[PDB]
């Protein structure tokens with residue numbers, strides 16, 4: 440049972456709302472298969488080594504994202520930045536779960552609300568195929584999503600977001616209460632019911648794939664998915680999106696992997712865990728893309744439009760597509776209930792760890808918080824609830840789009856780049872390899888050390904620079920955000936990016952001694968500070984810097 444349970448956790452430690460909700464519209468918005476080449480390249484080169492590095496760091500040092508930097512005191516700013524990014528993500532990650540809960544509540548009927556027009560939310564322009572360069576939003580499913588759930592028709596833009604929708608308000612309250620009561624006792628919440636949260640997503644995906652392959656237009660969708668537009672690979676939008684999606688689906692750069700690995704056994708095999716998680720993530724993402732593109736190829740045929748204009752390119756793509764596919768199944772109410780229960784379970788389980796990252800990271804830094812986990816959990820959860828109330832307004836989709844663009848973009852790329860630079864160069868890739876050997880019994884291969892020191896940092900720096908210099912003003916379908924929205928988004932990104940230099944400055948100023956003494960204290964592990972008075976600093980020799 441040692442292996443079956445590990446595989447179940449191991450397969451579970453691989454499917455989340457990233458693959459099921461975000462990857463579909465990033466693949467659609469970016470062509471089907473031209474998005475997969477950069478995705479796989481980044482996966483290998485940067486994602487797998489960084490996942491391995493974070494797991495090893497957490498396992499060896501037994502600390503969270505903030506306090507793990509006792510080895511290199513100058514990067515506690517990086518730790519704080521990743522904690523802040525994790526805090527930002529929840530604000531809308533928990534609005535997506537609220538959407539799922541609302542859809543589940545709406546699915547308890549013999550006539551699904553998204554099957555045809557004729558409802559109070561339907562507009563005169565609603566067009567039903569059965570009863571008779573834009574996106575088509577005049578379909579029953581699009582009309583339902585945008586008017587009976589979002590009520591987006593009551594907001595003219597991000598300047599007129601309006602008041603929170605009360606139904607989504609109740610759903611968000613329920614989600615927040617469930618999160619709090621699942622996090623208020625401690626980190627130990629696995630191995631009890633996660634079994635059904637690990638197999639249900641794959642059963643749902645398999646049934647969706649099998650049924651959608653045999654649909655009238657699925658062939659065209661599959662052909663578009665397997666076609667590669669090579670001109671799209673010369674624009675850097677696909678590359679930036681692929682890098683950000685890789686780091687958001689694997690979970691690196693948020694302080695979650697380090698926090699959870701801090702509770703591992705000192706001899707746990709992090710290499711095997713990283714390999715299996717990455718492989719399962721890639722396969723699941725590919726299958727999700729296949730199913731999604733089959734569904735929208737079917738829709739292109741049914742609605743008599745081009746496949747590029749069938750659906751939205753935003754965060755509601757799955758909430759349009761999956762209901763459309765469900766409506767084609769036999770006994771569609773049962774399948775809708777099953778699918779939205781699966782979405783609820785996936786989202787709640789993932790958000791649990793997402794918030795645990797922040798809680799553990801800040802409790803390791805302050806013991807007062809560690810002594811009062813209930814109050815601290817309540818505070819974190821309540822703050823998330825309010826800043827998510829900001830995202831369930833009539834124009835809450837605009838705020839959600841801005842957040843999904845800026846909270847973890849260049850910010851997360853920069854944070855992961857700083858993490859890799861810190862470890863590999865300042866702490867020492869040789870020291871890191873020695874720690875991994877002391878833990879798991881073997882030294883990492885040359886490929887892993889090369890990726891940690893040279894390859895991953897180079898690609899991360901390139902992608903950060905390209906994302907900064909090739910920045911497209913924010914949009915949502917046919918809506919163009921005002922420039923101040925772009926300024927606000929870049930400010931949100933900087934709020935996390937800037938913690939690193941600020942903490943470097945603060946650590947330098949708060950230390951006592953001469954300039955060289957301050958540097959030695961700042962780049963020396965906290966448990967070897969007695970060697971600084973001995974003028975024996977490894978980093979002050981070329982051997983440390985040329986070591987691989």
Ligand SMILES: Clc1ccc(-c2csc3[n+]2CCS3)cc1
Nearest residue numbers: 525528529532687690792793794
């Ligand atoms: Cl508030 C929050 C929600 C989700 C994440 C997240 C992004 S990838 C993964 N997670 C979590 C577990 S794996 C982080 C913070």
Ligand SMILES: [Cl-]
Nearest residue numbers: 458462688724
């Ligand atoms: Cl993904």
